[PDB]
């Protein structure tokens, strides 16, 4: 059986879809998935055993120079690749009008998606052949598992979702796996960042433990902050710039992670690595992670400026308890 998945945007949303592929694979041996996803996250689906062909899209990038000669070419290659196969099922796990009109609508096969009252954008429900009712009051990971279960004729396992992508890294874990912690400081908005000052204090509190700390960074200004956070700390290392897969191998070898509400935090949860995510303006109840050893840390008065290094270290300790 060959199924096509439409789940493009948000590294987090993409990662949350994995447990659903694990359920399907266990229930239906031989099942394989093709997956339409934003190029920036195209490596993620490849890490899962049930994933066959990845079909990248780069909306935002394209969208800005949409009629260009080179772009016109990419969009053409995309449509053709998208329509290449006749799927036994097309599952729109995105629930957006834009993705249903730009992707789902064009694929061959019975199209499944959420119904009018459960879809991210009600109107997208009109684009499906099969509309399923997926209760909103539950984690995104479970909602997608329910969607896959109902779309593919099998009952969702009572067990916790298994992202099943850690094994992709187990074979080539860093030599110093378990010897360090990874602090994910970079994110999309200022108010979501934990003040540099607190980061350095946390780091300082760990000085005599003998642990080492690695700092990822995806953009120049993020590298500069990482340099600032590392200064004077011989046991802290600013990572070189790497791919999603590369930073994913580093996370896999991390003993634990402290992070702000960002995609790499979601990657961490998918890799089953103990993780303490610190939230401020964003609510962990609505967008929290999912998985083993994930611990929520809400900043006082939803202001990260109020969260102390001491408080975060305490969570690390009690996250170790479990």
Ligand X SMILES: Nc1ncnc2c1ncn2[C@@H]1O[C@H](COP(=O)(O)OP(=O)(O)O[C@@H]2O[C@H]([C@@H](O)CO)[C@@H](O)[C@H](O)[C@H]2F)[C@@H](O)[C@H]1O
121 labelled as ligand-binding?
Answer: no
Q: How far is the CB of 255 from ligand X (least distance, A)?
A: 19
217 binds ligand X (CB under 6 A): yes
Q: How far is the CB of 278 from ligand X (least distance, A)?
A: 12
146 binds ligand X (CB under 6 A): no
88 labelled as ligand-binding?
Answer: no
Question: DSSP secondary structure string, 40-60?
Answer: GGTHHHHTSTTEEEEEEE-HH
Q: How far is the CB of 287 from ligand X (least distance, A)?
A: 4
Taking the C-alpha atoms of residue 198 and residue 182, their distance in angstroms, rounded to an integer, is 15
Taking the C-alpha atoms of residue 294 and residue 319, their distance in angstroms, rounded to an integer, is 8
Q: How far is the CB of 12 from ligand X (least distance, A)?
A: 4
262 labelled as ligand-binding?
Answer: yes
Taking the C-alpha atoms of residue 169 and residue 90, their distance in angstroms, rounded to an integer, is 29
Positions in 4-33 near ligand X (CB under 6 A): 10-12
179 binds ligand X (CB under 6 A): no
Are the beta carbons of 152 and 27 closer than 8 angstroms? yes
291 binds ligand X (CB under 6 A): no
Q: How far is the CB of 211 from ligand X (least distance, A)?
A: 21
309 binds ligand X (CB under 6 A): no
Taking the C-alpha atoms of residue 300 and residue 302, their distance in angstroms, rounded to an integer, is 5
Taking the C-alpha atoms of residue 3 and residue 239, their distance in angstroms, rounded to an integer, is 38
Taking the C-alpha atoms of residue 56 and residue 45, their distance in angstroms, rounded to an integer, is 11
289 labelled as ligand-binding?
Answer: no
Would you say 195 or 218 has its CB closer to ligand X? Answer: 218
Beta bridge partners of 114: 132
Taking the C-alpha atoms of residue 250 and residue 267, their distance in angstroms, rounded to an integer, is 11
Give the one residue of 55, 264, 269, 278 binding ligand X; rule: CB under 6 A: 264
Would you say 263 or 274 has its CB closer to ligand X? Answer: 263
Rounded to a whole number of angstroms, the CA Rg of the chain reads 20
Taking the C-alpha atoms of residue 137 and residue 259, their distance in angstroms, rounded to an integer, is 25
Would you say 186 or 278 has its CB closer to ligand X? Answer: 186
282 binds ligand X (CB under 6 A): yes
Give the one residue of 244, 269, 278, 312 binding ligand X; rule: CB under 6 A: 244
How far is the CA of 78 from the CAs of 75, 104, 214, in angstroms? 5, 13, 37
- Give the contacts of 64 (CB within 8 A, at least 6 positions apart): none
- The site that binds ligand X (CB under 6 A) totals a number of residues, namely 22
Q: How far is the CB of 185 from ligand X (least distance, A)?
A: 9
237 binds ligand X (CB under 6 A): no
Q: How far is the CB of 60 from ligand X (least distance, A)?
A: 12
188 binds ligand X (CB under 6 A): yes
Taking the C-alpha atoms of residue 213 and residue 313, their distance in angstroms, rounded to an integer, is 14
268 binds ligand X (CB under 6 A): no
46 binds ligand X (CB under 6 A): no
39 binds ligand X (CB under 6 A): no
Determine the 3-state secondary structure of 224 from DSSP.
helix
Helix, strand, coil abundance in the chain, percent, nearest 5? 45, 20, 40
266 binds ligand X (CB under 6 A): yes
Q: Provide the binding-site residues for ligand X, judged by CB under 6 A.
A: 10-12, 186-188, 216-219, 222, 242-244, 247, 261-264, 266, 282, 287
As annotated, the binding site includes 187-188, 192, 222, 242, 261-263, 266
As annotated, the binding site for ADP-L-glycero-beta-D-manno-heptose includes 187-188, 192, 222, 242, 261-263, 266
């Amino acid at each position: 059986m060959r199924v096509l998945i439409v789940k493009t945007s948000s590294m987090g949303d993409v990662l949350h879809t994995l447990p659903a592929l694990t359920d399907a694979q266990q229930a239906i041996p031989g099942i394989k998935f093709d997956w339409v996803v934003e190029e920036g996250f195209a490596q993620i689906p490849s890490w899962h055993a049930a994933v066959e062909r990845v079909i990248p899209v780069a909306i935002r990038r394209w969208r800005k120079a949409w009629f260009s000669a080179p772009i016109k070419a990419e969009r053409k290659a995309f449509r053709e690749a998208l329509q290449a196969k006749n799927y036994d099922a097309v599952i729109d796990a995105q629930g957006l009008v834009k993705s249903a009109a730009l992707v789902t609508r064009l694929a061959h096969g019975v199209k499944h998606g959420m119904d009018w009252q459960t879809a991210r954008e009600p109107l997208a429900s009109l684009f499906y052949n099969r509309k399923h009712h997926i209760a909103k009051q539950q984690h995104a990971v479970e909602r997608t598992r329910e969607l896959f279960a109902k779309s593919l004729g099998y009952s969702k396992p009572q067990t916790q979702g298994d992202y099943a992508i850690a094994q992709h890294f187990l074979t080539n874990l860093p030599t110093d796996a378990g010897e360090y912690a990874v602090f994910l400081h970079a994110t999309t908005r200022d108010d979501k960042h934990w003040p540099e000052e607190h980061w350095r204090e946390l780091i300082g509190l760990l000085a005599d433990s003998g642990i080492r700390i690695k700092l990822p960074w995806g953009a120049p200004h993020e590298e500069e902050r990482a340099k600032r956070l590392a200064e004077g700390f011989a046991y802290v290392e600013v990572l070189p710039k790497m791919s999603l897969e590369g930073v994913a191998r580093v996370l896999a070898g991390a003993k634990f992670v402290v992070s702000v509400d960002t995609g790499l935090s979601h990657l961490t949860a998918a890799l089953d690595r103990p993780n303490i995510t610190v939230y401020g303006p964003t609510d962990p109840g609505l967008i929290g992670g999912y998985g083993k050893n994930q611990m929520v840390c809400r900043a006082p008065g939803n202001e990260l400026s109020q969260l102390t290094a001491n408080a975060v270290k305490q969570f690390i300790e009690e996250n170790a308890e479990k």
